[PDB]
Ligand binder design. Structure first.
Ligand SMILES: *[C@@H]1O[C@H](CO)[C@@H](O[C@@H]2O[C@H](CO)[C@@H](O[C@@H]3O[C@H](CO[C@H]4O[C@H](CO)[C@@H](O)[C@H](O)[C@@H]4O)[C@@H](O)[C@H](O[C@H]4O[C@H](CO)[C@@H](O)[C@H](O)[C@@H]4O)[C@@H]3O)[C@H](O)[C@H]2NC(C)=O)[C@H](O[C@H]2O[C@@H](C)[C@@H](O)[C@@H](O)[C@@H]2O)[C@H]1NC(C)=O
Ligand SMILES: *[C@@H]1O[C@H](CO)[C@@H](O[C@@H]2O[C@H](CO)[C@@H](O[C@@H]3O[C@H](CO[C@H]4O[C@H](CO)[C@@H](O)[C@H](O)[C@@H]4O)[C@@H](O)[C@H](O[C@H]4O[C@H](CO)[C@@H](O)[C@H](O)[C@@H]4O)[C@@H]3O)[C@H](O)[C@H]2NC(C)=O)[C@H](O[C@H]2O[C@@H](C)[C@@H](O)[C@@H](O)[C@@H]2O)[C@H]1NC(C)=O
Ligand SMILES: *[C@@H]1O[C@H](CO)[C@@H](O[C@@H]2O[C@H](CO)[C@@H](O[C@@H]3O[C@H](CO[C@H]4O[C@H](CO)[C@@H](O)[C@H](O)[C@@H]4O)[C@@H](O)[C@H](O[C@H]4O[C@H](CO)[C@@H](O)[C@H](O)[C@@H]4O)[C@@H]3O)[C@H](O)[C@H]2NC(C)=O)[C@H](O[C@H]2O[C@@H](C)[C@@H](O)[C@@H](O)[C@@H]2O)[C@H]1NC(C)=O
Ligand SMILES: *[C@@H]1O[C@H](CO)[C@@H](O)[C@H](O)[C@H]1NC(C)=O
Ligand SMILES: *[C@@H]1O[C@H](CO)[C@@H](O)[C@H](O)[C@H]1NC(C)=O
Ligand SMILES: *[C@@H]1O[C@H](CO)[C@@H](O)[C@H](O)[C@H]1NC(C)=O
Ligand SMILES: *[C@@H]1O[C@H](CO)[C@@H](O)[C@H](O)[C@H]1NC(C)=O
Ligand SMILES: *[C@@H]1O[C@H](CO)[C@@H](O)[C@H](O)[C@H]1NC(C)=O
Ligand SMILES: *[C@@H]1O[C@H](CO)[C@@H](O)[C@H](O)[C@H]1NC(C)=O
Ligand SMILES: *[C@@H]1O[C@H](CO)[C@@H](O)[C@H](O)[C@H]1NC(C)=O
Ligand SMILES: *[C@@H]1O[C@H](CO)[C@@H](O)[C@H](O)[C@H]1NC(C)=O
Ligand SMILES: *[C@@H]1O[C@H](CO)[C@@H](O)[C@H](O)[C@H]1NC(C)=O
Ligand SMILES: *[C@@H]1O[C@H](CO)[C@@H](O)[C@H](O)[C@H]1NC(C)=O
Ligand SMILES: *[C@@H]1O[C@H](CO)[C@@H](O)[C@H](O)[C@H]1NC(C)=O
Ligand SMILES: *[C@@H]1O[C@H](CO)[C@@H](O)[C@H](O)[C@H]1NC(C)=O
Lengths: 171, 326, 326, 171, 326, 171
């Protein structure tokens, strides 16, 4: 995809992570588990919901065909009505089908970007205190307990705190 | 010790198309289009439709003797006309501006039938013998339209100038009908109306009408080589109608107080059953009960309906590309 | 020593909507839609509109005696007709193909009035007594249309065949009018036109017209139970009109050289004031002075106007999400 | 946002930078100041201006309703005209409103990407001669005077020139 | 040792526009719009068009004597009418509901001419002298329409009631024509039809027609101050026509079995040559031979054509921004 | 551009690479040459082809104007037909021209992203076994023969295999 994450450098999704669209899987001495990133997921839910509702609202008018009849000597106005009604039917069918194809492409890209940005946000915090495996996973050069893990996930990871310990194991 | 960044996958097999790629499986999606219908007619805003059954629109408002079931007052949310309805214009002839009449009736929600011109209106003529085998009732072989009077001359006497007037003092417009008889030959002409140049003239503040009989033989229809030219008009509130004729007049007898709807009007030509049910959206091919934005059922409807398109499906992705492992 | 990369912020509180997010404050944006109007009529391309004031379109081109202010030559960029205008068809009757006449007049920019048939045209009849209390002037109680002549028989004499002809040798089409009188009874018929079957027949290279009087009493309007059938037509350049009648003719007297516009035509029905001002875009509800692409003022206009939409606002972001610190 | 810079890893904008959409803030011995990146800003102004003008040009036709009247016996053609005029009004209202929502989303993304790309362009020049603070700011491992700063801003920064000095301070 | 990542460049100078940037050179692109045409008419679905040449539509189906080249059976994929065609309605008058007649004929693909009423049909009258110098053949100075019979009275005798009937027992509708003669004066009226009130009356199961002559002098056209009112109708399968007249009848003689097309119909008014060639898409201004999606040639066409737009070019980028070095 | 690669940190294209849209140029002891990345190129060809065909399919209806005539007393319905026919002509002209401008912008961005993602994919494999020159080129800290080059191109590059040798030359 466009941002290279979904079905990209992160080859597949997690059926194990059921409570959000994007998130984390950690492993430490206390074991392993899945956790959704609540902020990025909710932000995406709000955006996508807004998109759907906006499309619904813009599509909220109707063209109305009539039951009116035309006589044998009214072929021209009868045909005028038919071509008009068919005309708007073709316009709106086009508008609906084209929009769906376009927005589906962009919606999937949006998800792709959000995963990529989440990955970058973690990379940025950890720096050289961890090793990037290239598949969205990071191996710590230090022991990272549950609160250390949670600090990574909520954006408050303390790089200086683990720097020296990481440097020693790295070297 | 490890932490990984990743995304949701599930057991979804539901797919969408994009400009770049077809058949993409996604974790979540919403279908915007409705393709299901209930094949029946229901009430709209708690108001039932009018089933014309074996009568056509013409048979109904003209008062064809076999349409007595419909006769009188009617209220409707819409009209259902049956495709093979047999009871229309029984005595052969053209109902002028028919398509405009249908459009007008369709714009209404109620008619109240009343006697506009009692037979006493027409002084020197016979109002009791205007029947024909072309227009049978269910019980008698020769009858006529309930809203019209076929006027003929009294025995041997001449056919005089007859006059009638009606002042619409009410608040509602009045839908009324009348006719001009065209006999197949001068013999019938003299037998019914006597001799001399005949005319039918009518007028209001905004309308003039004048017609004379045109004697000739047309191919027989329902046993008749003669014809009637039927007409309709609308007498506005405060307007007065004057009728004047010395013969060949099919006179207005009963008419309708007409109540025009502020909503959309509809006339559905269909064989579908009317049942005891409610609906907010009624199409000509059935009821739509849906929260969806689009529908591919029908462009013809009354009520609050989704937008009609030709599409089979309009599914939006909301979730993401579904890539479950394994 | 440091260098940072960053982006502009400012004091903007102006917001836009996106598919993903509503109410987004942006540093720069442009409003594409115009919702302001000047509630008045101005000149279009330095050409003033025609105010019909207390006259309707019919009163104007028929020459209703109370419309003398309008009488004669007129040039216009568009037409303003006032809603409660009282001076129309004074002597009761229908002006046939009225809607098409309005559409035609609307497609023009100028009329030049001239005498098409001087009263001398009609040999054996009286052209001096055709007045009625239904059509008063401002100074006299009984008058008539300035463009028509109500012809009656001379004292006691019969009403003969009258004839008239006009050959349009000019380069412009001619808009002209005529009528057929329908008296309420045979007494008035004989009093005015004598006895015998009457006709009005007219023709050109491309038109035939034939009508006979239809005697009957209609509800009184402006004191009259009689009627006139008014007619109009357009005599093309090079065409000739022939008039022939033995009675009941409301004759053409004055007509108009008609100049058709290459621009869009407009007839605005409004109470808005015409002032001394210029405009490039004039809608029925006011002037638009704008550089904007859209407008929600009115779909009805003349001149160069923005596209009409129902939207309240169409603001495009040009700058970026405004995130000022603090 | 989609590219993660605006209201992202760069939390906020600069009211201090008044002469451009994207740019720099530097600090050295000679003091501190804001400067717009002229090239990226102008390129964006040209693009956005082109977008606005293109939308205006495509919207440059008008559907015209008429003042034509219809009689009591012309209900069908009268209604035909109304449904047609209403029909085009609904189409164009849709076209305008949907386009504005779509383009506003993409315009903001464009700005987001341009900031991200500007950040990357600086990161690429500086390499390990500076420390990335994660907020769009770089701390030099060497002294960088006004001409050094300007070289970073105009894309001609000399990495080898300051390499050895940076290496020593880094280690 | 090195590896670099990069992208394709080539010698393309072909450009596209984007919302952000005009005149962008790209490595690959596809033009969606067709602006080329073959300026000629070809066959559509192996079926040739009908060239009316020097005859107009009226001249053709009325049977103007100078249109004998067209006379009889015709099959067509579409119709070509030439702008300066001279042979139309030769004897002056109006063909009523002309525009609807053209729309009807246009909806067809074949007519079969047959004799609907042989001259023997009309008993007490003369069917041999109905010719006029207004309607010359190519060989004789005075002729008439091949599909009509101008009926006049026999020497000195009165003009009696004539009658005719035709029962359409076939499966195809029948297009037929008739007329009413309006002499310039009572002298011609008496000379041709004798004296007394004259009428023309016709009818089927679904149609009534009645007209009487209207005597008056109109400006001379092709030497005639008299007129004919021409009429047309369609006799449905199973319907019967009755004709009855005591004078002034231009009688139906030959008519057409009419075959309606299921495809789109077209009447192209053009000077373009019809050649021996095939096409799948034929516009009024020429043939389109293309695989493209859009065209800016013409909105008027028959066959399978690209969508018409006003655009000069609709080029989609497929490849990428072309940045060749050096 | 939006993703910063095309006419970006990779200044220009390669006329030398004729068999694909995106790819590689390598230099080693056996010489130098161009090679297309077949997977990314084909994926893009499939996508773009699908886009073109989808646009063609959505544009696959026609509004049909008629040859019908109107008399002198049919100015209103005659004008109705004209405004209707002109109306749909304006709608479809708008739809076609706007769509082309929009899709051309996005198609070029798609190519830009694919080049960027290809670059990232190589950067990720090589790590510190190579030096990033900032122009899309990587200089190996080790000898990389034809099979090593091909392993980089097909995503199977062996970082541990060359790690020690690269580390020594790097230091
Ligand atoms: C992001 O995620 C991190 C990790 O989970 C979270 O930080 C933890 O927050 C909790 C609760 O605020 C902290 O628990 C308190 O810890 C203090 C500090 O003493 C201990 O921690 C330090 C390390 O900083 C050790 O060195 C010491 O030896 C101690 O083990 C402790 O005093 C306190 O106990 C008092 O308060 C209790 C309240 O229930 C009371 O019951 C008790 O009797 C005591 O009076 C808590 O036990 C935990 O230490 C934090 N972990 C770290 C590594 O800092 C972030 O949330 C908070 O972060 C802290 C730093 C504050 O800034 C709060 O305002 C944050 O809300 C979380 N951030 C976000 C934004 O979600
Ligand atoms: C990107 O931004 C950089 C930084 O501002 C800019 O480079 C500077 O450009 C100016 C003007 O071209 C240079 O000023 C001249 O410097 C020379 C070199 O001597 C001094 O610099 C070197 C460092 O390279 C020191 O080691 C020496 O000790 C000196 O201090 C100097 O000879 C010259 O003086 C002559 O010319 C004067 C013209 O007014 C004249 O008055 C005087 O009497 C002398 O005859 C200038 O003083 C400055 O040195 C550059 N700085 C650096 C670090 O290189 C880039 O613009 C130019 O860059 C140089 C390298 C050339 O390639 C020009 O073509 C560029 O235009 C700027 N680039 C872009 C694209 O905007
Ligand atoms: C991505 O690109 C790489 C590089 O081109 C490619 O890997 C090469 O694949 C070929 C063919 O599969 C290998 O050639 C065989 O090599 C074996 C191993 O011995 C030699 O290689 C090792 C290094 O691993 C050296 O240390 C030794 O000293 C040897 O030089 C060799 O036994 C074999 O010879 C037998 O098979 C021949 C079949 O024709 C037969 O003729 C002969 O008589 C022998 O019975 C081949 O010569 C080559 O070594 C690979 N290079 C490397 C560096 O691994 C990838 O394709 C394959 O990769 C290997 C590792 C397997 O996993 C295959 O399944 C892959 O298809 C390529 N990958 C993709 C996905 O395209
Ligand atoms: C998917 O799994 C859920 C359980 O999480 C199950 O209830 C549902 O039936 C499954 N649906 C499909 C389509 O596989
Ligand atoms: C993909 O779409 C095609 C349409 O050609 C359909 O036949 C098929 O069922 C779809 N494939 C799936 C659902 O795996
Ligand atoms: C018309 O022809 C049919 C078929 O022969 C016949 O049954 C019918 O009676 C005829 N009707 C008239 C009116 O001639
Ligand atoms: C009806 O529409 C609502 C709108 O959000 C949707 O969420 C809901 O699932 C729909 N109802 C059913 C029963 O599917
Ligand atoms: C914004 O600030 C400018 C000064 O830069 C001032 O002139 C203007 O009035 C302010 N506008 C708003 C809306 O705050
Ligand atoms: C956001 O839009 C809402 C519309 O519901 C409006 O009421 C409100 O003023 C806006 N909020 C602002 C301008 O802060
Ligand atoms: C009609 O009735 C009203 C109300 O009574 C009356 O004032 C008016 O004179 C009447 N007009 C006619 C023509 O009968
Ligand atoms: C009118 O439109 C131009 C078009 O660019 C715009 O720049 C200008 O600000 C507008 N004029 C005023 C007074 O706002
Ligand atoms: C481009 O180069 C090809 C050879 O690769 C040549 O055949 C062709 O004529 C050239 N076209 C243009 C437009 O330069
Ligand atoms: C760019 O487009 C312009 C349109 O104004 C055209 O005149 C010119 O030829 C184009 N430039 C090229 C093809 O280099
Ligand atoms: C009309 O006038 C022209 C120009 O003088 C003349 O040639 C023509 O004969 C006239 N026609 C009639 C019918 O008066
Ligand atoms: C006709 O259209 C096809 C559709 O893919 C296209 O590939 C081909 O190049 C076109 N034919 C010619 C001769 O250009």
């Amino acid at each position: 995809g466009i941002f290279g994450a979904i079905a990209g450098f992160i080859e597949g999704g997690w059926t194990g992570m059921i409570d959000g669209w994007y998130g984390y899987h950690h492993e430490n001495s206390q074991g392993s588990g899945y956790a959704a990133d609540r902020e990025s997921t909710q932000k995406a839910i709000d955006g996508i919901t807004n998109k759907v509702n906006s499309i619904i609202n813009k599509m909220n008018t109707q063209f109305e065909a009539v039951d009116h009849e035309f006589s044998n000597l009214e072929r021209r106005i009868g045909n005028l009505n038919k071509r008009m009604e068919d005309g708007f039917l073709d316009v709106w069918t086009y508008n609906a089908e084209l929009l769906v194809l376009l927005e589906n492409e962009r919606t999937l890209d949006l998800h792709d970007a959000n995963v990529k940005n989440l990955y970058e946000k973690v990379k940025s915090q950890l720096r050289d205190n961890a090793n990037d495996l290239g598949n969205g996973c990071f191996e710590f050069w230090h022991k990272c307990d549950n609160e250390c893990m949670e600090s990574v996930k909520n954006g408050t990871y303390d790089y200086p705190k683990y720097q020296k310990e990481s440097k020693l194991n790295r070297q | 010790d490890k932490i990984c960044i990743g995304y949701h996958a599930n057991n979804s097999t539901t797919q969408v198309d994009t400009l770049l790629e077809k058949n993409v499986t996604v974790t979540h999606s919403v279908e915007l289009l409705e393709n299901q219908k209930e094949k029946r007619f229901c009430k709209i805003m708690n108001k039932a439709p009018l089933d014309l059954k074996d009568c056509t629109i013409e048979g109904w408002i003209l008062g064809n003797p076999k349409c007595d079931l419909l006769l009188g007052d009617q209220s409707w949310s819409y009209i259902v006309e049956r495709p093979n309805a047999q009871n229309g214009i029984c005595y052969p002839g053209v109902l002028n501006e028919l398509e405009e009449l249908k459009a007008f009736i369709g714009s209404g929600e109620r008619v109240e039938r009343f006697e506009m011109f009692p037979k006493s209106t027409w002084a020197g003529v016979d109002t009791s013998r205007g029947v024909t085998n072309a227009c049978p009732s269910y019980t008698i072989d020769s009858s006529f339209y309930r809203n019209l009077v076929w006027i003929v001359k009294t025995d041997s006497a001449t056919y005089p100038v007859i006059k009638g007037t009606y002042n619409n003092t009410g608040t509602q417009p009045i839908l009324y009908f009348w006719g001009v008889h065209h006999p197949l030959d001068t013999t019938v002409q003299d037998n019914l109306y006597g001799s001399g140049d005949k005319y039918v003239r009518m007028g209001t503040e905004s309308m003039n009408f004048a017609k004379s009989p045109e004697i000739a033989a047309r191919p027989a229809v329902n046993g008749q080589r003669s014809r009637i030219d039927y007409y309709w008009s609308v007498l506005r509130p405060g307007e007065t109608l004057n009728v004047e004729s010395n013969g060949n007049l099919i006179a207005p007898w009963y008419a309708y107080k007409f109540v025009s709807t502020n909503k959309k009007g509809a006339v559905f030509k269909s064989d579908l059953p009317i049942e005891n049910c409610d609906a907010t959206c009624q199409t000509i091919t059935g009821v739509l009960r849906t929260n969806k934005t689009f529908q591919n059922v029908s462009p013809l409807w009354i009520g609050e309906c989704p937008k009609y398109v030709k599409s089979e499906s309009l599914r939006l992705a909301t979730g993401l590309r579904n890539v479950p492992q394994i």
